[PDB]
Tab-separated table of C-alpha atoms and ligand atoms in Angstrom:
chain	number	residue	atom	x	y	z
A	1	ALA	CA	7.835	8.210	8.279
A	2	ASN	CA	4.257	7.852	9.703
A	3	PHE	CA	2.538	5.545	7.452
A	4	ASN	CA	5.650	4.008	5.530
A	5	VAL	CA	4.222	0.798	6.983
A	6	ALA	CA	5.119	-2.093	4.243
A	7	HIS	CA	8.910	-2.917	5.035
A	8	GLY	CA	7.930	-3.689	8.707
A	9	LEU	CA	4.915	-5.762	7.222
A	10	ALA	CA	7.017	-7.826	4.975
A	11	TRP	CA	9.764	-8.370	7.449
A	12	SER	CA	7.487	-9.286	10.134
A	13	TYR	CA	5.422	-11.773	7.988
A	14	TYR	CA	8.493	-13.277	6.804
A	15	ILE	CA	10.521	-13.571	9.824
A	16	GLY	CA	7.601	-13.936	12.367
A	17	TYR	CA	5.748	-16.144	10.540
A	18	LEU	CA	6.790	-18.002	7.138
A	19	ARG	CA	10.464	-18.579	8.315
A	20	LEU	CA	9.090	-20.488	11.213
A	21	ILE	CA	6.359	-22.300	9.739
A	22	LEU	CA	6.959	-23.177	6.640
A	23	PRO	CA	9.794	-25.867	7.249
A	24	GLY	CA	7.319	-28.113	9.538
A	25	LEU	CA	4.785	-27.618	6.860
A	26	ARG	CA	5.479	-30.979	5.000
A	27	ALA	CA	5.715	-33.086	7.930
A	28	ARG	CA	2.447	-31.736	9.356
A	29	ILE	CA	0.989	-32.588	5.867
A	30	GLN	CA	2.670	-36.383	5.893
A	31	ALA	CA	0.838	-36.719	8.751
A	32	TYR	CA	-2.359	-35.367	7.998
A	33	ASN	CA	-2.293	-37.826	4.853
A	34	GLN	CA	-1.152	-40.818	7.369
A	35	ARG	CA	-4.469	-39.939	9.432
A	36	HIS	CA	-6.881	-39.189	6.923
A	37	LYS	CA	-5.988	-40.821	3.258
A	38	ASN	CA	-7.964	-43.922	3.849
A	39	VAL	CA	-10.993	-42.249	4.771
A	40	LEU	CA	-10.918	-38.194	3.904
A	41	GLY	CA	-8.515	-38.400	1.330
A	42	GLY	CA	-4.972	-36.466	1.417
A	43	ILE	CA	-3.642	-33.456	0.284
A	44	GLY	CA	-0.806	-33.609	-2.913
A	45	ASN	CA	0.155	-30.423	-2.764
A	46	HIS	CA	2.145	-29.475	0.055
A	47	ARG	CA	2.851	-25.964	-0.380
A	48	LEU	CA	1.207	-23.098	1.725
A	49	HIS	CA	-1.077	-20.811	-0.226
A	50	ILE	CA	-1.177	-17.251	0.658
A	51	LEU	CA	-3.731	-14.908	-1.077
A	52	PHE	CA	-2.648	-11.348	-1.206
A	53	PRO	CA	-5.514	-9.045	-2.511
A	54	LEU	CA	-4.181	-5.965	-3.565
A	55	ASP	CA	-7.353	-3.969	-2.521
A	56	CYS	CA	-6.839	-5.265	1.061
A	57	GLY	CA	-10.465	-6.948	1.083
A	58	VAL	CA	-9.488	-9.848	3.459
A	59	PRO	CA	-12.669	-11.697	4.821
A	60	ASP	CA	-11.942	-13.973	7.749
A	61	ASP	CA	-14.160	-16.619	6.110
A	62	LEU	CA	-12.640	-17.710	2.818
A	63	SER	CA	-16.171	-18.845	1.557
A	64	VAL	CA	-17.621	-15.331	2.239
A	65	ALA	CA	-14.956	-14.276	-0.555
A	66	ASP	CA	-16.266	-16.838	-2.908
A	67	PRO	CA	-19.056	-19.275	-2.087
A	68	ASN	CA	-16.781	-22.115	-4.474
A	69	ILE	CA	-13.988	-22.340	-1.410
A	70	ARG	CA	-14.968	-24.724	1.233
A	71	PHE	CA	-13.618	-25.543	4.296
A	72	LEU	CA	-12.095	-29.072	4.137
A	73	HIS	CA	-10.336	-29.773	7.432
A	74	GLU	CA	-7.850	-28.308	10.001
A	75	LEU	CA	-4.132	-29.010	9.403
A	76	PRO	CA	-3.347	-29.246	12.848
A	77	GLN	CA	-0.076	-28.009	15.197
A	78	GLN	CA	2.823	-30.374	15.509
A	79	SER	CA	2.521	-31.785	18.971
A	80	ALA	CA	4.511	-29.564	21.462
A	81	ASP	CA	8.162	-31.070	21.583
A	82	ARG	CA	9.077	-33.366	24.754
A	83	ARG	CA	2.523	-19.720	20.018
A	84	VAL	CA	1.025	-22.609	18.349
A	85	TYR	CA	0.254	-22.479	14.360
A	86	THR	CA	-2.766	-23.900	12.909
A	87	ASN	CA	-3.803	-23.886	9.120
A	88	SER	CA	-6.987	-24.711	7.421
A	89	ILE	CA	-6.992	-26.494	4.205
A	90	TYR	CA	-9.817	-26.047	1.579
A	91	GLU	CA	-11.687	-27.553	-1.654
A	92	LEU	CA	-12.403	-25.425	-4.575
A	93	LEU	CA	-15.527	-26.167	-6.192
A	94	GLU	CA	-15.997	-26.092	-10.351
A	95	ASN	CA	-19.405	-26.546	-11.800
A	96	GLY	CA	-20.384	-27.379	-7.895
A	97	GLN	CA	-17.783	-30.486	-8.336
A	98	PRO	CA	-14.493	-30.570	-6.232
A	99	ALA	CA	-11.618	-29.530	-8.427
A	100	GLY	CA	-8.624	-28.858	-6.174
A	101	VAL	CA	-7.561	-29.085	-2.495
A	102	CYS	CA	-4.899	-26.736	-0.736
A	103	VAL	CA	-3.735	-25.360	2.541
A	104	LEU	CA	-4.946	-21.787	1.956
A	105	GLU	CA	-5.073	-18.614	3.790
A	106	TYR	CA	-4.660	-14.752	3.229
A	107	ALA	CA	-1.639	-12.555	4.301
A	108	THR	CA	-3.517	-11.240	7.202
A	109	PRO	CA	-1.103	-8.282	7.381
A	110	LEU	CA	-3.295	-6.936	4.590
A	111	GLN	CA	-5.887	-6.383	7.234
A	112	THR	CA	-3.614	-3.927	9.080
A	113	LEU	CA	-3.254	-2.030	5.842
A	114	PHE	CA	-7.328	-1.719	5.518
A	115	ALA	CA	-7.909	-0.574	9.099
A	116	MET	CA	-5.358	1.996	8.763
A	117	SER	CA	-7.341	3.346	5.492
A	118	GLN	CA	-10.463	3.414	7.626
A	119	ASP	CA	-9.955	6.133	9.973
A	120	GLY	CA	-4.179	10.711	6.955
A	121	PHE	CA	-3.771	7.530	5.138
A	122	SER	CA	-5.853	6.973	1.823
A	123	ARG	CA	-7.094	4.112	-0.019
A	124	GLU	CA	-4.513	5.807	-3.052
A	125	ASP	CA	-2.068	5.524	-0.172
A	126	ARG	CA	-2.966	1.958	0.742
A	127	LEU	CA	-2.750	0.228	-2.436
A	128	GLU	CA	0.848	1.758	-2.931
A	129	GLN	CA	1.616	0.257	0.761
A	130	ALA	CA	-0.182	-3.204	-0.380
A	131	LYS	CA	1.901	-3.057	-3.543
A	132	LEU	CA	5.325	-2.435	-1.559
A	133	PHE	CA	4.439	-4.965	0.861
A	134	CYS	CA	4.108	-7.692	-1.840
A	135	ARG	CA	7.427	-6.562	-3.823
A	136	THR	CA	9.160	-6.308	-0.596
A	137	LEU	CA	8.205	-10.152	0.320
A	138	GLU	CA	8.630	-11.234	-2.942
A	139	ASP	CA	12.227	-9.575	-2.609
A	140	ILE	CA	12.753	-12.065	0.734
A	141	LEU	CA	11.217	-14.839	-0.418
A	142	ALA	CA	13.459	-14.887	-3.847
A	143	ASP	CA	16.720	-14.874	-1.327
A	144	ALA	CA	14.982	-17.637	0.851
A	145	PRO	CA	14.974	-20.952	-1.164
A	146	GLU	CA	13.250	-23.082	0.847
A	147	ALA	CA	10.823	-20.846	2.036
A	148	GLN	CA	10.038	-20.069	-1.734
A	149	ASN	CA	9.715	-23.643	-2.357
A	150	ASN	CA	7.019	-24.202	0.466
A	151	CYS	CA	4.738	-21.249	-0.503
A	152	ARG	CA	2.969	-19.677	-3.344
A	153	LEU	CA	1.699	-16.062	-3.263
A	154	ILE	CA	-1.511	-15.453	-5.093
A	155	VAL	CA	-1.782	-11.915	-6.151
A	156	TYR	CA	-4.700	-10.171	-7.651
A	157	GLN	CA	-6.335	-6.375	-7.594
A	158	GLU	CA	-10.126	-7.363	-7.429
A	159	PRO	CA	-12.376	-6.629	-4.523
A	160	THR	CA	-13.702	-10.451	-4.222
A	161	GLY	CA	-18.726	-10.375	-4.900
A	162	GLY	CA	-18.562	-9.375	-8.452
A	163	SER	CA	-17.731	-11.688	-11.550
A	164	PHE	CA	-14.352	-12.370	-10.699
A	165	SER	CA	-13.994	-15.874	-9.079
A	166	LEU	CA	-11.335	-16.270	-6.514
A	167	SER	CA	-11.807	-19.858	-6.498
A	168	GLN	CA	-10.993	-20.310	-10.467
A	169	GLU	CA	-7.992	-17.828	-9.799
A	170	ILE	CA	-6.408	-20.276	-7.130
A	171	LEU	CA	-7.252	-23.493	-9.307
A	172	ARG	CA	-5.153	-21.878	-12.211
A	173	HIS	CA	-2.458	-21.368	-9.922
A	174	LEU	CA	-2.793	-25.204	-8.429
A	175	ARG	CA	-2.618	-26.396	-11.879
A	176	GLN	CA	0.431	-24.295	-13.151
A	177	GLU	CA	2.434	-25.850	-9.814
A	178	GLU	CA	1.894	-29.499	-10.669
A	179	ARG	CA	3.537	-28.293	-14.324
B	1	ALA	CA	15.260	-6.392	0.843
B	2	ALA	CA	17.779	-3.649	1.848
B	3	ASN	CA	15.364	-0.959	3.443
B	4	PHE	CA	15.244	-1.971	6.889
B	5	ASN	CA	13.003	0.745	8.386
B	6	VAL	CA	10.505	-1.422	9.575
B	7	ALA	CA	9.499	-0.041	12.974
B	8	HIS	CA	6.305	2.097	12.093
B	9	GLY	CA	5.064	-1.000	10.254
B	10	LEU	CA	5.873	-2.869	13.295
B	11	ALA	CA	3.912	-0.439	15.378
B	12	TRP	CA	0.832	-0.441	13.337
B	13	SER	CA	1.273	-4.325	12.763
B	14	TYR	CA	1.188	-4.951	16.542
B	15	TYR	CA	-1.622	-2.353	17.146
B	16	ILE	CA	-4.194	-3.546	14.335
B	17	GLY	CA	-2.950	-7.331	14.319
B	18	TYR	CA	-3.008	-7.934	18.638
B	19	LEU	CA	-3.985	-5.097	20.797
B	20	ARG	CA	-7.070	-3.761	18.987
B	21	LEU	CA	-8.014	-7.464	18.438
B	22	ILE	CA	-7.338	-8.761	22.057
B	23	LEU	CA	-7.245	-5.864	24.546
B	24	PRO	CA	-11.364	-5.216	23.840
B	25	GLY	CA	-12.122	-8.598	25.252
B	26	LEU	CA	-9.439	-9.204	27.705
B	27	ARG	CA	-11.312	-7.923	30.689
B	28	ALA	CA	-14.400	-10.320	30.170
B	29	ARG	CA	-11.647	-13.128	30.163
B	30	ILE	CA	-10.034	-12.003	33.202
B	31	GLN	CA	-13.463	-11.569	34.841
B	32	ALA	CA	-14.309	-15.254	33.781
B	33	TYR	CA	-10.973	-16.735	34.867
B	34	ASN	CA	-12.095	-15.186	38.189
B	35	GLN	CA	-15.399	-16.307	38.439
B	36	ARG	CA	-14.263	-20.039	37.787
B	37	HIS	CA	-11.571	-19.999	40.010
B	38	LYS	CA	-12.241	-17.338	42.847
B	39	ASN	CA	-13.181	-19.691	45.754
B	40	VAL	CA	-10.246	-21.593	44.953
B	41	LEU	CA	-7.030	-19.685	43.147
B	42	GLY	CA	-7.831	-16.184	44.503
B	43	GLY	CA	-8.849	-13.262	42.340
B	44	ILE	CA	-6.889	-11.004	39.753
B	45	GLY	CA	-7.516	-7.597	40.624
B	46	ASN	CA	-5.494	-5.984	38.058
B	47	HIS	CA	-7.214	-6.332	34.383
B	48	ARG	CA	-4.566	-4.452	32.170
B	49	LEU	CA	-2.390	-6.705	29.788
B	50	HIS	CA	1.429	-5.798	31.223
B	51	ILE	CA	3.695	-5.742	27.945
B	52	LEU	CA	7.456	-6.040	28.274
B	53	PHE	CA	9.592	-4.012	25.996
B	54	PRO	CA	13.274	-5.080	26.668
B	55	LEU	CA	14.993	-2.564	24.308
B	56	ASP	CA	17.780	-4.759	23.440
B	57	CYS	CA	14.897	-7.295	21.958
B	58	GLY	CA	16.184	-10.089	24.190
B	59	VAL	CA	12.716	-12.040	24.385
B	60	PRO	CA	12.980	-15.403	26.238
B	61	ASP	CA	10.576	-17.969	24.725
B	62	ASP	CA	9.778	-19.201	28.201
B	63	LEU	CA	9.558	-15.773	30.352
B	64	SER	CA	8.453	-18.293	33.638
B	65	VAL	CA	11.305	-20.478	33.273
B	66	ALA	CA	13.641	-17.433	32.522
B	67	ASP	CA	13.113	-15.901	35.942
B	68	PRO	CA	13.174	-17.621	39.264
B	69	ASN	CA	11.145	-14.628	40.851
B	70	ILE	CA	8.679	-14.680	37.727
B	71	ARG	CA	6.212	-17.727	38.106
B	72	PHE	CA	3.753	-19.183	35.795
B	73	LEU	CA	0.017	-18.986	37.471
B	74	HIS	CA	-2.734	-19.967	34.739
B	75	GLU	CA	-3.674	-19.372	31.670
B	76	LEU	CA	-6.730	-17.448	30.653
B	77	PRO	CA	-9.681	-18.503	28.550
B	78	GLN	CA	-8.332	-19.058	25.340
B	79	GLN	CA	-9.551	-16.661	22.333
B	80	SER	CA	-10.443	-18.208	19.527
B	81	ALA	CA	-11.573	-16.818	16.176
B	82	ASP	CA	-11.601	-17.175	12.345
B	83	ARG	CA	-8.804	-14.875	11.204
B	84	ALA	CA	-8.317	-14.062	7.388
B	85	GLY	CA	-8.936	-17.763	6.230
B	86	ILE	CA	-7.389	-19.712	9.039
B	87	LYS	CA	-10.227	-21.043	11.075
B	88	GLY	CA	-9.884	-21.157	14.740
B	89	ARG	CA	-6.538	-18.897	14.973
B	90	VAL	CA	-6.265	-19.172	18.941
B	91	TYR	CA	-4.745	-16.065	21.109
B	92	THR	CA	-3.553	-17.301	24.465
B	93	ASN	CA	-2.597	-14.803	27.227
B	94	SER	CA	-1.284	-15.992	30.543
B	95	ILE	CA	-1.000	-14.847	34.652
B	96	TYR	CA	1.965	-14.611	36.288
B	97	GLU	CA	2.849	-14.528	39.974
B	98	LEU	CA	5.688	-12.130	40.862
B	99	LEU	CA	8.395	-12.677	43.930
B	100	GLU	CA	9.780	-10.358	45.937
B	101	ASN	CA	12.249	-11.351	49.153
B	102	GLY	CA	10.906	-15.002	48.531
B	103	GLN	CA	7.536	-14.319	48.980
B	104	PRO	CA	4.395	-13.830	46.447
B	105	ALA	CA	3.755	-9.488	45.975
B	106	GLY	CA	2.171	-9.706	42.765
B	107	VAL	CA	-0.172	-11.052	39.919
B	108	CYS	CA	-0.923	-9.910	36.553
B	109	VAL	CA	-1.198	-10.632	33.007
B	110	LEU	CA	1.983	-10.353	31.486
B	111	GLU	CA	4.094	-10.968	28.084
B	112	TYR	CA	6.681	-9.447	26.030
B	113	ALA	CA	6.346	-7.421	22.746
B	114	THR	CA	6.482	-10.012	20.294
B	115	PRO	CA	7.883	-7.679	17.279
B	116	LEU	CA	10.900	-7.265	19.243
B	117	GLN	CA	11.845	-10.891	18.218
B	118	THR	CA	11.349	-9.689	14.521
B	119	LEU	CA	14.037	-7.184	15.100
B	120	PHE	CA	16.302	-9.293	16.922
B	121	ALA	CA	15.972	-12.146	14.185
B	122	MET	CA	16.959	-9.428	11.671
B	123	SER	CA	20.249	-8.053	13.169
B	124	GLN	CA	21.408	-12.101	13.185
B	125	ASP	CA	20.685	-12.973	9.605
B	126	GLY	CA	23.814	-12.049	7.828
B	127	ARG	CA	22.433	-8.993	5.723
B	128	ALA	CA	24.713	-6.170	5.683
B	129	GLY	CA	23.100	-2.723	6.972
B	130	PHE	CA	21.659	-3.940	10.250
B	131	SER	CA	23.936	-4.122	13.071
B	132	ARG	CA	22.822	-4.511	16.944
B	133	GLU	CA	22.846	-0.470	16.553
B	134	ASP	CA	20.336	-0.100	13.936
B	135	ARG	CA	18.450	-2.668	15.855
B	136	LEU	CA	17.929	-0.604	18.928
B	137	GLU	CA	17.093	2.618	17.232
B	138	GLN	CA	14.547	0.632	15.595
B	139	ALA	CA	13.211	-0.867	18.813
B	140	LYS	CA	13.226	2.827	20.500
B	141	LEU	CA	11.614	4.294	17.095
B	142	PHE	CA	8.832	1.025	17.590
B	143	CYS	CA	8.250	1.733	21.175
B	144	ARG	CA	7.913	5.574	20.630
B	145	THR	CA	5.415	4.936	17.578
B	146	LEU	CA	3.118	2.248	19.605
B	147	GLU	CA	3.069	4.649	22.568
B	148	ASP	CA	2.155	7.470	20.058
B	149	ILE	CA	-0.848	5.233	18.645
B	150	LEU	CA	-2.064	4.637	21.883
B	151	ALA	CA	-2.010	8.110	23.054
B	152	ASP	CA	-4.805	8.543	20.569
B	153	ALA	CA	-6.584	4.970	21.813
B	154	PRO	CA	-7.696	5.973	25.134
B	155	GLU	CA	-9.536	2.487	25.622
B	156	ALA	CA	-6.598	0.518	24.607
B	157	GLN	CA	-4.290	2.495	26.488
B	158	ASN	CA	-6.615	1.905	29.639
B	159	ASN	CA	-6.532	-1.862	28.906
B	160	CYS	CA	-2.627	-2.257	28.829
B	161	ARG	CA	0.655	-1.045	30.280
B	162	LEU	CA	3.829	-0.707	28.361
B	163	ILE	CA	6.990	-1.629	30.775
B	164	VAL	CA	9.868	-0.253	28.532
B	165	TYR	CA	13.304	-0.975	29.962
B	166	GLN	CA	17.047	-1.184	29.285
B	167	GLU	CA	19.050	-4.080	30.699
B	168	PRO	CA	22.562	-3.690	31.854
B	169	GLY	CA	22.688	-9.073	35.475
B	170	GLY	CA	21.880	-8.419	39.256
B	171	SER	CA	21.909	-4.638	38.894
B	172	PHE	CA	18.254	-5.151	37.504
B	173	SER	CA	15.418	-7.060	38.365
B	174	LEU	CA	12.276	-7.821	35.840
B	175	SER	CA	10.401	-8.766	38.728
B	176	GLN	CA	10.890	-5.701	40.358
B	177	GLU	CA	10.537	-3.579	37.462
B	178	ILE	CA	6.810	-5.085	36.925
B	179	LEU	CA	6.306	-4.603	40.488
B	180	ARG	CA	6.905	-1.214	40.583
B	181	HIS	CA	4.596	-0.625	37.764
B	182	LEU	CA	1.764	-2.523	39.180
B	183	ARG	CA	2.119	-0.397	42.445
B	184	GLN	CA	2.136	2.575	40.383
B	185	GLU	CA	-1.345	1.617	38.922
B	186	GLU	CA	-2.846	1.109	42.247
B	187	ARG	CA	-2.233	4.468	43.077
C	201	LIG	N1	0.546	-17.973	15.267
C	201	LIG	C1	0.063	-17.378	13.937
C	201	LIG	N2	-0.859	-17.846	13.074
C	201	LIG	C2	-1.105	-17.159	11.823
C	201	LIG	N3	-0.442	-16.100	11.434
C	201	LIG	C3	0.834	-15.857	12.100
C	201	LIG	C4	1.033	-16.385	13.443
C	201	LIG	N4	2.214	-15.783	13.905
C	201	LIG	C5	2.301	-14.925	13.119
C	201	LIG	N5	1.589	-14.874	12.156
C	201	LIG	C6	1.586	-13.979	10.701
C	201	LIG	O1	2.573	-13.145	10.805
C	201	LIG	C7	2.601	-11.985	10.918
C	201	LIG	C8	3.178	-11.163	11.712
C	201	LIG	O2	3.708	-11.783	13.240
C	201	LIG	P1	4.371	-11.211	14.432
C	201	LIG	O3	4.465	-12.141	15.285
C	201	LIG	O4	5.758	-11.012	13.938
C	201	LIG	O5	3.787	-9.767	14.762
C	201	LIG	C9	2.351	-9.925	15.197
C	201	LIG	C10	2.423	-10.490	16.838
C	201	LIG	O6	3.599	-8.997	17.360
C	201	LIG	C11	1.287	-9.798	17.425
C	201	LIG	N6	0.544	-11.146	17.796
C	201	LIG	C12	-0.361	-11.555	16.692
C	201	LIG	N7	-0.627	-12.737	16.880
C	201	LIG	C13	0.016	-13.099	18.329
C	201	LIG	C14	-0.556	-14.141	19.370
C	201	LIG	N8	-0.787	-14.997	19.219
C	201	LIG	N9	0.531	-13.688	20.519
C	201	LIG	C15	1.021	-12.951	20.580
C	201	LIG	N10	1.378	-12.084	19.733
C	201	LIG	C16	0.470	-11.857	18.652
C	201	LIG	O7	0.753	-8.943	16.252
C	201	LIG	C17	1.803	-9.005	15.341
C	201	LIG	C18	0.967	-8.789	13.901
C	201	LIG	O8	-0.131	-10.029	13.902
C	201	LIG	P2	-1.167	-10.298	12.616
C	201	LIG	O9	-1.562	-11.522	12.916
C	201	LIG	O10	-1.132	-9.038	12.172
C	201	LIG	O11	0.162	-10.893	11.511
C	201	LIG	C19	1.188	-11.858	11.828
C	201	LIG	C20	0.483	-12.800	11.036
C	201	LIG	O12	0.332	-12.448	9.730
C-alpha cells in the first residue's frame, strides 16, 4: 500500500489527540468560564467541534474559510502538573450579529491528504481517502462513549468562497446539539 | 475499527504534519539560539534534528530523566503558527547533551518519533488482532516508509537524521548509539 493512509490518519488522530485532549476539555472550559464570564462572557457548549471538509480544503485561519467565523479567545492549556494542547474559541456571525460560540478547529490530518495530492495520488484518490478517514474515525468514536460525547464531527463536501456558508453549517449543528 | 494497517498513514502523517513543517525553519532556530547564547552557553554546530526510532515503540515521556547520560540543555526558540484553525499552535524542540565516561561528549537537537506512541497505545487498548508482534512489523514498516519518503526529499534528509534501533539494558546505551551517529555525520 503506498497511499492507503486513511487508517493511519484515523487511528493517530484518535489515539494521539482526541483520546488525550477530550477528557480534560470540560475542566478547561469551566476554568475559562470562571475567569471570563463576568466580562468576556462564557462558553455554554463544552464539546470540541471538528470541521471535516471532504475536499480537504483546510485553511489555517477559519476566517479565511468564512468571514462570519471570528476568533474569540484562546482556550489555554491546563497548567503543567506539580506536548501542550491549546484550542481556539470562535464566534459565528449571522446578519452581522453574534449567533453562536464554540470551541472549533479542523481535522488537521486532512492537510496531509491535501499535500499528498499536490505532487501517483489523485484528487479522485484523495476524496476516497478522506471518506475512509472519516468513516474509520466515526467507527472508533462510536466505540468510545466519553470521547464521542465530548466532540462533534462536522462533515461537508463543499470547497468553502462560494455560496455555501460554513458558519451557517456550524450553527445548524450547534442548535441541534442543544436539542 | 479492525484494519490496523496504519504504518503508511503514520509515515505520511509524520512527514507532512511535522517534518515538512518543522525541518525547513530548524537551522534558523538553532542559529538564533547560538546568536543569543554563544558567548555564554557555547555553540551548537550540528544543525540536524535527531529522531529516535525505538523499534519496540517504547517512548519515555521524559527523555532527559529517562537516561542519566542524556541531559536536557536548552529549548530552541519556539515555533508558533496558526494551524488548521488552532491559533498559535506551538512546536518546541530541545537540545540535549550526551555524556560518556561521565564527561560531556555531544550536544544535539534530539527527540523521539512520536508516531511510535500511537503503535504502542494500539497494542494495549484491548482490541483483538493487534499484538506486540503486529506492533513490531508496523513499526518497521513505518520506519521503512518514512525513509522511502525522505529518499525523495533531499532537503528534508539533509535536515534530519533517523536513529533506528532495537533495544535488548546495559548491553545497549542510547547515549552511545546517538554519539556514534553524531560522530558519523562529522565525517
Ligand atoms: N498538540 C496538538 N495540538 C493540536 N493537534 C494535535 C496535537 N497533537 C496531535 N494533534 C492532532 O493529532 C494528529 C496526530 O498526532 P500524532 O501525534 O499522532 O502525530 C503527529 C506527530 O507524530 C507529529 N507531530 C505533530 N505535532 C507535533 C509536535 N508538536 N511535537 C512532536 N511531534 C508532532 O506529526 C504527526 C501529525 O501531526 P498532525 O498535526 O498532522 O496531526 C495531528 C493533529 O491533528
